[PDB]
Design a protein around this ligand. Structure first.
Ligand SMILES: CN[C@@H]1C[C@H]2O[C@@](C)([C@@H]1OC)n1c3ccccc3c3c4c(c5c6c(n2c5c31)CCCC6)C(=O)NC4
Length: 611
């Protein structure tokens, strides 16, 4: 078939949608699925993983045994409810004996595992954990997730307002905390309780998280409400964990009680209750003792689950690969991907035949593909100089789609200072045809004309740009990368905004151009575009000099974090510099809109033309 397996291998998408999509060949088993997924992620501790299946409307859960083939698994469950109300998630179930230490040396797992626990914390107990706790744990994730943001960042009103009003505090703290307490007050608490977690790197935040959490949430063991006994029955909470084996208790608070160490389980057996109710009957045989320790579950399903667990642990505590449970060509498992909504309608109209393009010389070097210059011959019309953007690893089916997504967007745009889309060639290898800006890249152009480009032409470029940006701001499109490197010159008196491509996924940077919230929290809005335009004006006014020449990249973060700003360029009017510094207002909401910058530059233009 295939089948969507949710998991916890981090990715810069909304966490709910973290999966892999696996095409399986017929008698492929659960082991096989799992085996592929963890190898995508360079996992060492492979034995620790399992595959759980749950309905959505009902909260019962099924642990799928390694050997059970996926095929007979789908059939036997999905013989009741549609594949849409079934969710398969990979998880960590069988923990080794020093598991945190162990995982320290298995980064992907330690991460997977953190992500796993957090989620259960968020779902099960966060909303009634002690309140300094929610605070601390919340802080730890903040500290972890934004591993690039300076430790004192949250002392700035507006930084916090990005979290609160843009990212969502619900992402880090439980619902009850947030609405039980005054926004203004909450700000301060968070501020104070972050102080201590300010200098912790990622790994350390995770360990502190566990260390803080465990004392009040026991993710190290799994507890069960079940009756023990043979024909004589008593009532307990069974406890299975790597550090104790198999304990019970009833008591109140006082000590639990050992039953059996995993290195002692001879065999595992599970029937339905051979009597009145279909209760879960689990039959553990223990080294020495001729009495098979009987356990009674409230359902077979729960019996199945407990069996899995123990079985998992025995297959672990001993180097074994195969079951401790009594038994009453074609392991294809390719990792694929997306089944997205098709490309919007659509090309019939801006389709170009490849025979109508002569592909000349190379002029630019992209990530996903090169940019060449060429001739285009529409026979109704004369030859045309064009830019052609070509795709490198062309037949990665969804790489192609993300590619010519760029062509779709460019189709919606029509503006004197944004590079026209001429057409597309949608067949591998896909090309996109755009107008060719002959005088090329702005930086170089300025550098070369440093002593023959008057101040007036300089502000013209700035203006021309701002119009392009306003145009885009109006169409709610965020560019994410405004810099002279990205601006072409079609003419001595004419620049055009270029690019509009994708950088997914995720990935992980033009720091020296970046709005601080981009650097701290990875938000990119129109306001950060205004920031970057700021730097871009500077660049222009500095005749293509790089902001912060010879300045190291965490040196820049701090400079700016403190209050430093790029110096007033030589022979830049004082208004325009005033206009730049507004763009570099730290707090986003204080920067002007492009529509407003357009208007200023316009008048700064006229004044400077007449004087
Ligand atoms: C970082 N500067 C590069 C200069 C070069 O190649 C790049 C990769 C970049 O220009 C935006 N480039 C694009 C990237 C993505 C979409 C469109 C273009 C693009 C385009 C052109 C272009 C040119 C050059 N570069 C161009 C382009 C260098 C020489 C002048 C012409 C172009 O003329 N139309 C689109």
């Amino acid at each position: 078939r295939v089948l969507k397996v949710f998991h916890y291998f981090e990715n810069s998408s909304e966490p709910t949608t973290w999966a892999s999509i696996i095409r399986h060949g017929d008698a492929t088993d659960v082991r096989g699925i799992i085996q592929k997924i963890v190898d995508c992620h360079k996992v060492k501790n492979v034995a620790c993983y399992g595959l759980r299946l749950s309905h959505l409307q009902s909260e019962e859960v099924h642990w799928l045994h390694l050997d059970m083939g996926v095929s007979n698994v789908r059939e036997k469950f999905e013989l009741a409810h549609p594949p849409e109300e079934w969710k398969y998630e990979l998880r960590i179930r069988y923990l080794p004996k020093g598991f945190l230490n162990q995982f320290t040396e298995d980064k992907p797992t330690l991460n997977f595992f953190y992500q796993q626990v957090k989620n259960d914390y968020m779902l099960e107990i966060a909303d009634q954990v002690d309140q300094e706790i929610a605070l601390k744990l919340g802080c730890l994730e903040i500290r972890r997730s934004y591993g690039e943001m300076r430790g004192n960042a949250l002392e700035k009103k507006s930084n916090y307002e990005v979290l609160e009003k843009d990212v969502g505090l619900r992402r880090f703290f439980p619902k009850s905390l947030l609405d039980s307490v005054k926004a203004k007050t909450l700000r301060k608490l968070i501020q104070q309780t972050f102080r201590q977690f300010a200098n912790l790197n990622r790994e350390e935040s995770i360990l502190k998280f566990f260390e803080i959490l465990s004392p009040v949430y026991r993710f190290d063991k799994e507890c069960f409400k079940c009756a023990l006994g043979s024909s004589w029955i008593i009532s307990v909470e069974l406890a299975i964990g790597p550090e104790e084996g198999i304990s019970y208790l009833t008591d109140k608070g006082a000590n639990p009680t050992h039953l059996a160490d995993f290195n002692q389980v001879q065999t595992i057996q599970y029937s339905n209750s051979e009597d009145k109710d279909r209760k879960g009957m689990l039959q553990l045989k223990i080294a020495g003792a001729p009495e098979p320790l009987t356990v009674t579950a409230p359902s077979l399903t729960i019996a199945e689950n407990m069996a899995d667990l123990i079985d998992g642990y025995c297959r672990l505590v001993n180097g074994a690969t195969q079951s401790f449970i009594i038994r009453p060509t074609d392991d294809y498992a390719e990792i694929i991907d997306e089944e997205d909504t098709y490309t919007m309608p659509s090309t019939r109209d801006y389709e170009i035949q490849r025979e109508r393009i002569e592909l000349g010389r190379c002029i630019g070097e992209g990530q996903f593909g090169d940019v060449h210059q060429g001739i285009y011959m529409s026979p109704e019309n004369p030859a045309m100089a064009v830019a052609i953007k070509t795709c490198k690893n062309c037949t990665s089916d969804s790489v192609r789609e993300k590619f010519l997504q760029e062509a779709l967007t460019m189709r919606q745009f029509d503006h004197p200072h944004i590079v026209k889309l001429i057409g597309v060639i949608t067949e591998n290898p896909v090309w996109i045809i755009m107008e060719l800006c002959t005088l090329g890249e702005l930086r170089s152009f300025l550098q070369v004309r440093k002593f023959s480009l008057d101040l007036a032409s300089l502000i013209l470029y700035a203006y021309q740009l701002s119009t392009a940006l306003a145009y885009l701001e109006s169409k709610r499109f965020v560019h994410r990368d405004i810099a002279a490197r990205n601006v072409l010159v079609s003419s001595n008196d004419c620049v055009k905004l270029g690019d509009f491509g994708l950088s997914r996924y995720m990935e992980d940077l033009p720091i020296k151009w970046m709005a601080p919230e981009s650097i701290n929290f990875r938000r990119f809005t129109s306001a950060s575009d205004v920031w970057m335009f700021g730097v871009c004006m500077w660049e222009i006014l500095m005749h293509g000099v790089k902001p912060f020449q010879g300045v190291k990249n965490n040196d820049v973060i701090g400079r700016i974090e403190n209050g430093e700003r790029l110096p007033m360029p030589p022979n830049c009017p004082p208004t325009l510099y005033s206009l730049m510094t507004k763009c570099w207002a730290y707090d986003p909401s204080r920067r002007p809109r492009f529509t407003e910058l357009k208007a200023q530059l316009s008048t700064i233009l006229e004044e400077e033309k007449l004087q």
